[PDB]
Symmetry: D2
Subunit: 106 residues, 4 copies
């Protein structure tokens, strides 16, 4: 099946979490990927992404508009094309970040 | 072409940073994915710093890069790297281009 | 970067070749992978010719390329393309660089 | 699991088919991938590949030394690294090819 894709770019805007008929969360956001040109950054590819499970609660509590991210997903369709994120992460090319999750909250 | 790879695994060690006479930084760390694939990775410039600055042993990471060679074995010429937000959360940011 | 893709599917039609005022060729064909993903693909220069020359409807193909945009939707800027030797055999060749 | 990889390059030499303790065929061959540089083709990455099932009988009856190919596989290990080809095909960037397989032989 595969037809997987890795996309690196910035978030067009703060994620948008959804919870539809099943009580399930869907972190929506579109990744904007800029290329590289040369004649003497140019134009961008905007990719509407979807991320589920509690992988979306983090993708919400962690990422925000303008955030550069690395997205590993799969290309699905139904007239548009969207990536069903399997993995998402804040690219440390131009930033830092504290991590982990196992204890705390109550 | 420039044959590329993407590894989603766990860091075996803590990014080991160093600086080249070029004034350029370079961090090394091997990503271990799960039947066990151990890929050593390299990262240059500021990215090197950011990695050491915020990454540690057994941390979930998504890595995109390019395979390389010579000595032989294949290592990774990481382009982008970051924490995996699968089983964890993490806030970020920096900025200032050129 | 230049975000890349690899599609393993079946050609819906027969590569449709054309020539640009630039004297350059260009073949179009949509690759349909299996819950059905339909990716339109583009191929330029000699490659265009070779494709039309040897590919036809519902043929198993491995395609590596780059996603693009504008009009919108995403199409594929194929780099390499060839018959899939999974459920079939096929002999080849050409040559002469520059 | 994934850690899949697509590699495009020429075959270092005619494939080498194996049939080991199970009566199973293993089409072995190593893909040589050349890069692109510029200062004013450079150096190659050699990737030992493995391909099974009857996907190897074709990979044997079809490809030969110098053949440019597109390989979709997975990176496995056990001190070396080898790609376990899921898909293989003759790149039509610089060549042509007749196809299909369903009737004939006896």
């Amino acid at each position: 099946g595969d037809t997987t894709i890795t996309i690196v770019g910035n978030l067009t805007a703060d994620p948008e979490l959804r919870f539809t008929p099943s009580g399930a969360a869907v972190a929506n956001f579109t990744v904007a990927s800029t290329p590289r040109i040369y004649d003497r950054d140019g134009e961008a590819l905007f990719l509407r992404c979807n991320i589920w499970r509690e992988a979306a609660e983090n993708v919400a509590e962690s990422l925000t508009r303008g955030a550069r991210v690395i997205v590993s997903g799969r290309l699905k369709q139904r007239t548009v094309i969207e990536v069903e994120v399997d993995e998402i992460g804040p690219s440390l090319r131009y930033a830092t970040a504290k991590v982990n999750k196992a204890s705390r909250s109550g």
